[PDB]
Design a protein around this nucleic acid. Sequence first.
DNA 1: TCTTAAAATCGAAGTTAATATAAACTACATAACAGACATAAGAACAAGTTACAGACGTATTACATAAGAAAAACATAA
Length: 112
Amino acid sequence: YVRVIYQFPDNLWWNEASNQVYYAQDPMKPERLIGTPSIMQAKLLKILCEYHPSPCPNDQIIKALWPHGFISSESLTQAIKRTRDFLNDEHKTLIENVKLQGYRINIIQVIV
DNA sequence: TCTTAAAATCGAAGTTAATATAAACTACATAACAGACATAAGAACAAGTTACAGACGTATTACATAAGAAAAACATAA
């Protein structure tokens, strides 16, 4: 299997196969499980992972989250807000808003 | 009371569209124009919050059917 595991600052782990996000209370020990994201949290995470390290423009983010939807940018803002909330990113470091160029996700390493 | 000078008036409409000759210099203060800066107003991007909708997921309700247990009836042996 092509397994991709993403390591994020504050030793966050996102496992793509199980679609699970968990705090590491050790180097890579899974015991503190933040949980399972919904089917847009995962989509936007996939978008920001596929464009790393380049910022992703908002238009393509919306076209990937809503392929056939006339969705206002308010839903974009609050989707980013809720994804950062459920990742416990109150310091705006995990999903950074590239000023006047879109969004980036802070990812340290990829394990295959 | 008799001349004699002033004063006032003289149809409507319609039309009816400019002229046009003829000192110099100096000093000073004030107004106007142009350039630059800071400020109030404005726009764009992103974030927080508060709520309602939408379809999924939970609990209340009424059962179908099949396995298990009790009981009544029957056949058999003493």
